[PDB]
């Protein structure tokens, strides 16, 4: 059961993470913009 | 109705709710010498404070808690549900051990386990959450120690390092660990000054201290690289990848360090040992609590607790049917 809670936040944190690369694309593009 | 977690342990108390992150309170704990509950009174006073003091609630309305020493006896965890149920009237409960609430914590089922307190420490290997109890090895070699190696040393500069003046004597010999030592060899070193501004120029005394858990009785590294010979054959390689440290007593400056390199030249260089850094005061002193706090936090300990339904039905029988 813990292990199923942290896979549940493992998913949380490759979301977040995904997001955040997709976030800093977007800083980079208005920057330059 | 928020879950109450406590830790009981050896040298702080660690008590707070299920869903948030800290232990709201952590003061001082003594009933556990060895590791268990000697004074049956007096760790009855002390919970009690626990609950009307430190955290302003009744326990007969949150569903609590407690965690106990991985080498404790089971007459201890009898007569700890025989005396919680009995006098504070909780609705549920659940007892875990602490190595196993560590690797927990460190969201790693499978786990190696080091950690030390009032006058102990230990080596447990725990594999999907279960403590080896023949694969433990527990040494004399705890925070006592060295903090009486400290107070020797002190006693030899001669400095003036009723019961509350002791605490205070043992606490600054503990802040001094935190600030000063670290695992003429040691070069020109820190001017650590007293709260009435004494001090000195702590030398080599800062490096010959910490030097006595590995060499001062079973070193740390021995009692773990023992602690898995004793246990099983095959999960010896998940044990080494997955070694754990917890406890505030391991706060020490490149004690971790130390201990990768002394486990590293010690197993197989084939072997792929590692420690995982919670090197941070805060994390080791949270780690056991941490754990609780997730255990309890699930939607599973609802069905994991001994209710108080389960306690009217039966006596102590219930702690070793239901708590691993």
Not at chain 2, 49 to 62: D, I, N, P, R
């Amino acid at each position: 059961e813990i292990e199923c809670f942290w896979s549940n936040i493992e998913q949380v944190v490759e979301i977040k993470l995904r997001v955040e690369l997709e976030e800093k694309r977007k800083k980079a593009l208005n920057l330059q913009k | 109705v928020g879950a109450l977690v406590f830790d009981i342990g050896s040298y702080t108390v660690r008590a707070g709710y299920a869903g948030e992150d800290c232990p709201k309170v952590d003061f001082p704990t003594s009933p556990l010498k060895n590791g268990m509950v000697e004074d049956w009174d007096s760790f009855q006073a002390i919970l009690d404070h626990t609950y009307k003091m430190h955290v302003k609630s009744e326990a007969s309305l949150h569903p609590v808690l407690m965690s106990e020493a991985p080498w404790n006896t089971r007459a201890k965890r009898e007569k700890l549900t025989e005396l919680m149920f009995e006098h504070y009237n909780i609705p549920a409960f659940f007892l875990c051990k602490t190595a196993v609430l560590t690797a927990f914590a460190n969201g790693r089922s499978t786990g190696l386990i080091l950690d030390s307190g009032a006058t102990h420490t230990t080596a447990i290997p725990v594999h999907d959450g279960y403590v080896l109890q023949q694969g433990i090895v527990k040494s004399p070699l705890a925070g006592d120690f060295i903090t009486m190696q400290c107070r020797e040393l002190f006693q030899e500069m001669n400095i003036e390092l009723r019961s509350w003046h002791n605490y205070m004597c043992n606490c600054v010999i503990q802040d001094f660990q935190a600030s000063v030592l670290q695992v003429a060899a040691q070069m020109p070193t820190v001017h650590y000054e007293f709260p009435n501004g004494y001090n000195c120029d702590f030398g080599a005394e800062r490096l010959k201290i910490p030097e006595g858990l590995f060499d001062p009785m079973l070193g740390v590294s021995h009692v773990v690289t023992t602690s898995v010979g004793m246990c099983d054959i095959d999960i010896r390689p998940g044990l080494y990848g997955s070694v754990i440290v917890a406890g505030g007593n391991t706060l020490i400056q490149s004690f971790t360090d130390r201990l990768n390199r002394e486990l590293s030249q010690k197993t197989p260089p084939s072997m792929r040992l590692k420690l995982i850094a919670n090197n941070t005061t805060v994390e080791r002193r949270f780690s056991s609590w941490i754990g609780g706090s997730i255990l309890a936090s699930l939607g599973t300990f609802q069905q994991m607790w001994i209710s108080k339904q389960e306690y009217e039905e039966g006596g102590k029988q219930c702690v070793e049917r239901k708590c691993p």
